[PDB]
Amino acid sequence: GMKTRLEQVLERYLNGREVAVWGVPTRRLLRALKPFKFHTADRVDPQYHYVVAVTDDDLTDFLSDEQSKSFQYANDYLTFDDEGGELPFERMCFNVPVGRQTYFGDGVVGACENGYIKSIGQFTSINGTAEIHANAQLNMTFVSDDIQNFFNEESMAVFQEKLRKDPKHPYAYSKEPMTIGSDVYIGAHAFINASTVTSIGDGAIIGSGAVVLENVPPFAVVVGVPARIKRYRFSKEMIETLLRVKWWDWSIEEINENVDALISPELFMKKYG
Amino acid sequence: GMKTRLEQVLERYLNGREVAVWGVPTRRLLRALKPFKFHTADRVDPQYHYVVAVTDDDLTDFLSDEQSKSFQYANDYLTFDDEGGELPFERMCFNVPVGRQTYFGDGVVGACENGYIKSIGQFTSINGTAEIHANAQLNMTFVSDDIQNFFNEESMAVFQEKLRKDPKHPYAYSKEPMTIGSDVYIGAHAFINASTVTSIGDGAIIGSGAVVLENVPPFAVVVGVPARIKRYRFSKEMIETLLRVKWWDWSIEEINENVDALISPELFMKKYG
Amino acid sequence: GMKTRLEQVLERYLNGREVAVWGVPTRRLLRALKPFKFHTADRVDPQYHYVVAVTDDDLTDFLSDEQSKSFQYANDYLTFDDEGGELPFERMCFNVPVGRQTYFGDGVVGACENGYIKSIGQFTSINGTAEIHANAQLNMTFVSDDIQNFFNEESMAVFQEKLRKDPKHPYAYSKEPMTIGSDVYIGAHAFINASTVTSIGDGAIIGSGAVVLENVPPFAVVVGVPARIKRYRFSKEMIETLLRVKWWDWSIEEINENVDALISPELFMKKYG
Ligand SMILES: NC[C@H]1O[C@H](O[C@H]2[C@H](O)[C@@H](O[C@H]3O[C@H](CO)[C@@H](O)[C@H](N)[C@H]3O)[C@H](N)C[C@@H]2N)[C@H](N)C[C@@H]1O
Numbered sequence: 001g002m003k004t005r006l007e008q009v010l011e012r013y014l015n016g017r018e019v020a021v022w023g024v025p026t027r028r029l030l031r032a033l034k035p036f037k038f039h040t041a042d043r044v045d046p047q048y049h050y051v052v053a054v055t056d057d058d059l060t061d062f063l064s065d066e067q068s069k070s071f072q073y074a075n076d077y078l079t080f081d082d083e084g085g086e087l088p089f090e091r092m093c094f095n096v097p098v099g100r101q102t103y104f105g106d107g108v109v110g111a112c113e114n115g116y117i118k119s120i121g122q123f124t125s126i127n128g129t130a131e132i133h134a135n136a137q138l139n140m141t142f143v144s145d146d147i148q149n150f151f152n153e154e155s156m157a158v159f160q161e162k163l164r165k166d167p168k169h170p171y172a173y174s175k176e177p178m179t180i181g182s183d184v185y186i187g188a189h190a191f192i193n194a195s196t197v198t199s200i201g202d203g204a205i206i207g208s209g210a211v212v213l214e215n216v217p218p219f220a221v222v223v224g225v226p227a228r229i230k231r232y233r234f235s236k237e238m239i240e241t242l243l244r245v246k247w248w249d250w251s252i253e254e255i256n257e258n259v260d261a262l263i264s265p266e267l268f269m270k271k272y273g
Numbered sequence: 274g275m276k277t278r279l280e281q282v283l284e285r286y287l288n289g290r291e292v293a294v295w296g297v298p299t300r301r302l303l304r305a306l307k308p309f310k311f312h313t314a315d316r317v318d319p320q321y322h323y324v325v326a327v328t329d330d331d332l333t334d335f336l337s338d339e340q341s342k343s344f345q346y347a348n349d350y351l352t353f354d355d356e357g358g359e360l361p362f363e364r365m366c367f368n369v370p371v372g373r374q375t376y377f378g379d380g381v382v383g384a385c386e387n388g389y390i391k392s393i394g395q396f397t398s399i400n401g402t403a404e405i406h407a408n409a410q411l412n413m414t415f416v417s418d419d420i421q422n423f424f425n426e427e428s429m430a431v432f433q434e435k436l437r438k439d440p441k442h443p444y445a446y447s448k449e450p451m452t453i454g455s456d457v458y459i460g461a462h463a464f465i466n467a468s469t470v471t472s473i474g475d476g477a478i479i480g481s482g483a484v485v486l487e488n489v490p491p492f493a494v495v496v497g498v499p500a501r502i503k504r505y506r507f508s509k510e511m512i513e514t515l516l517r518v519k520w521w522d523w524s525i526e527e528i529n530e531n532v533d534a535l536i537s538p539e540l541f542m543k544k545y546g
Numbered sequence: 547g548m549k550t551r552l553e554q555v556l557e558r559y560l561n562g563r564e565v566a567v568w569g570v571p572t573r574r575l576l577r578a579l580k581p582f583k584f585h586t587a588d589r590v591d592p593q594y595h596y597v598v599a600v601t602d603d604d605l606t607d608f609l610s611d612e613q614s615k616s617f618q619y620a621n622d623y624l625t626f627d628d629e630g631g632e633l634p635f636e637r638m639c640f641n642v643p644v645g646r647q648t649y650f651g652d653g654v655v656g657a658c659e660n661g662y663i664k665s666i667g668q669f670t671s672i673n674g675t676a677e678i679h680a681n682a683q684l685n686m687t688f689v690s691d692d693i694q695n696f697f698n699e700e701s702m703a704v705f706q707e708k709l710r711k712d713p714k715h716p717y718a719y720s721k722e723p724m725t726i727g728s729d730v731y732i733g734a735h736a737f738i739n740a741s742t743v744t745s746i747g748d749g750a751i752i753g754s755g756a757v758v759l760e761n762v763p764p765f766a767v768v769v770g771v772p773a774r775i776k777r778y779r780f781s782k783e784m785i786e787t788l789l790r791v792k793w794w795d796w797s798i799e800e801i802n803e804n805v806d807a808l809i810s811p812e813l814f815m816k817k818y819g
């Protein structure tokens with residue numbers, strides 16, 4: 001990927017204001033800010049500046065300052081050290097689609113970096129301590145991966161080809177990057193196997209501490225080690241219609257009107273069933 | 274909550290010395306220190322200064338410096354970036370009671386912030402990678418929580434009321450904040466469900482990687498996914514008397530005298546049974 | 547332990563160049579660099595400088611800079627905040643042997659600090675969120691460990707002796723520090739019990755989220771809570787010969803030649819069986 005979660009915000013919300021850095025500036029912050037005018041935060045004002053808190057640590061201090069009461073969550077301030085943070089619009093994590101009001105931890109950001117993710121839906125909650133890791137080669141005399149560094153150009157060839165041919169897909173090789181649907185909840189200390197999973201269905205619930213080794217159907221609940229299907233969120237009737245209506249792609253338009261539907265499943269289907 | 278773990282220490286142990294910052298100062302450190310006199314650490318002396326190490330990283334460097342051999346653990350130095358660290362006196366984590374020589378990771382500090390915790394006992398060890406998270410709404414068409422941000426004032430009402438009425442207590446709503454007793458041990462990669470747990474009994478042991486979904490009785494051992502009662506630490510005789518004596522509330526007074534009792538359970542009951 | 551992963555590299559690869567710090571300097575970096583000449587990175591050149599990125603965050607920014615394309619992974623740059631990072635040569639983590647192209651997270655670095663580790667083999671991959679923790683005392687009225695701080699010199703004696711006598715080895719007391727063989731893979735959110743484990747066999751695979759309570763035989767696969775032996779990587783024939791040949795101690799010499807053997811187990815034994 002190429003661009004910063006902050007810069008996507010600044011490109012959309014800065015609106016000719018100065019960036020006000022609230023916190024100790026880092027190397028890659030200073031770079032992400034070089035297209036803009038910035039200075040260390042002193043006295044701030046939503047009319048004059050965009051406050052950028054470097055770390056979540058720095059954000060708590062700003063919010064606890066009386067000057068923060070006029071700044072709206074994303075239109076006026078942001079936390080630099082939070083590439084998995086949620087936004088009110090569709091965004092990129094490296095080059096990975098992430099829908100509105102979707103969030104994930106650094107473990108998922110790295111999976112976005114390693115090309116493990118094809119896409120992440122809308123209104124999806126992935127806890128920070130979740131993880132997405134692929135497998136190493138299991139059909140070889142060795143299991144290590146950093147022995148590669150000792151390989152020369154010749155040995156590298158014969159090694160990379162067997163990885164491409166392996167149908168178990170070590171390092172998610174020769175497969176499709178996995179997809180995460182919308183309205184998905186993922187517990188903590190969880191594991192989705194990038195070497196065997198290609199699709200988390202929309203609405204799929206992944207319990208805490210669950211290790212998910214196969215694709216999860218939409219609106220399924222999975223817990224345990226390994227993950228088993230404990231229940232389904234909704235009767236199948238809802239499931240087919242929910243795939244049809246796709247509430248998660250509604251604009252803020254249809255969300256506030258149909259709040260009574262989105263809140264009572266019973267009310268949702270008496271109108272859309 | 275309102276106040277800093279460091280400031281509670283400085284209010285009690287500074288004793289008219291200067292704070293000596295050992296490390297790169299952060300935004301919220303600089304604020305926590307504005308009631309006091311401070312300067313970047315150069316040459317230090319327990320008579321002259323209170324050394325404040327910013328991060329646990331910065332603490333290791335100070336202890337490894339020859340100037341640190343005269344500073345006692347809490348009376349003379351402290352690590353700013355350790356709100357879950359243990360103290361020799363009863364303290365607050367935000368507005369949460371935390372007894373003496375009790376510690377926990379940032380996951381528990383956030384639960385203290387989210388109001389999930391009512392209290393934490395004395396001499397309780399909670400590993401850093403432990404976690405306390407509540408559940409989202411399960412009786413709604415959606416499971417997401419940050420869709421809220423898209424709600425207006427009108428849709429917000431009808432949404433918040435159903436949360437208050439939900440007996441499953443999403444986000445620990447309309448329940449009592451959970452309590453953690455004294456002499457409690459909690460393994461790592463563990464989970465206590467703030468949406469269904471209200472009391473960890475005194476002495477309760479929570480094995481590593483265990484997901485705890487219901488209240489744990491005092492002095493019970495729980496492991497597995499989900500957590501089951503593997504054994505009890507003590508015969509019930511000890512349990513009733515341990516609730517009566519409550520050694521964990523002894524001053525340092527009765528601790529050093531009754532060390533032979535506190536060390537041999539057999540000796541503990543021949544004196545208190 | 548005594549010395550820095552960076553300093554072991556600088557002592558071997560600096561070769562009369564200047565250290566160029568890429569990132570905000572920390573207290574313990576500034577100390578690790580005091581034997582050398584250094585300055586904040588401006589324009590860099592592998593001939594003139596050794597680039598030191600402070601944090602993994604700072605490393606990503608350097609690699610993404612056009613000046614980084616001439617710097618080789620370890621000979622020319624390094625990440626200070628990565629004591630578990632892999633190296634092309636045998637190294638120390640505190641005073642713990644760590645072989646070539648071996649890596650582990652901070653959880654394992656702390657175990658190296660707590661003296662829990664005797665050694666770590668070659669070409670071994672331990673994920674960052676892995677952990678190695680010992681147990682507290684289970685034969686005492688209390689389970690807490692920081693009550694110790696309240697003990698005086700007298701009560702300390704009678705407490706420390708019972709720890710030394712405990713055959714369950716709380717805090718890995720009176721046992722041998724555990725050993726991790728070569729070609730070992732360890733999943734994330736995993737647990738090796740320093741209070742009951744003394745040897746992870748060479749080639750042993752530890753699945754994600756697995757809690758390992760007993761020694762693991764060489765080339766065994768363990769998953770589940772608690773860990774059970776799911777399968778063996780190789781037929782026993784390979785296992786005995788793999789212990790004999792010990793490919794992991796080959797120089798880069800025998801690695802690139804025998805790549806066809808190291809890649810096809812079938813080819814490995816037709817030559818070494
Ligand atoms: N604070 C209580 C809430 O925590 C979570 O949501 C919260 C998310 O966890 C938050 O996510 C942020 O915090 C998490 C956790 O540290 C990070 O993984 C993530 N990258 C960062 O953006 C996000 N910024 C706010 C959202 N309300 C729970 N899913 C719901 C709970 O009520």
Ligand SMILES: NC[C@H]1O[C@H](O[C@H]2[C@H](O)[C@@H](O[C@H]3O[C@H](CO)[C@@H](O)[C@H](N)[C@H]3O)[C@H](N)C[C@@H]2N)[C@H](N)C[C@@H]1O
Nearest residue numbers: 355357358359376377378379398400401660691717
């Ligand atoms: N060092 C070995 C010990 O580690 C732990 O205790 C230790 C605690 O884990 C320590 O807690 C500190 O370290 C932990 C872990 O990083 C952090 O979660 C916590 N917030 C921080 O305050 C605390 N400062 C010291 C205490 N001896 C084990 N419970 C016992 C073990 O012998």
Ligand SMILES: NC[C@H]1O[C@H](O[C@H]2[C@H](O)[C@@H](O[C@H]3O[C@H](CO)[C@@H](O)[C@H](N)[C@H]3O)[C@H](N)C[C@@H]2N)[C@H](N)C[C@@H]1O
Nearest residue numbers: 114145171628630631632649650651652671673674
């Ligand atoms: N990037 C994808 C790869 O991630 C891992 O390897 C990678 C290791 O996890 C890396 O280790 C580094 O990153 C890990 C994870 O953050 C840290 O625990 C560790 N201390 C740090 O040195 C190491 N520097 C590079 C190595 N290729 C997987 N084992 C293999 C996967 O293909």
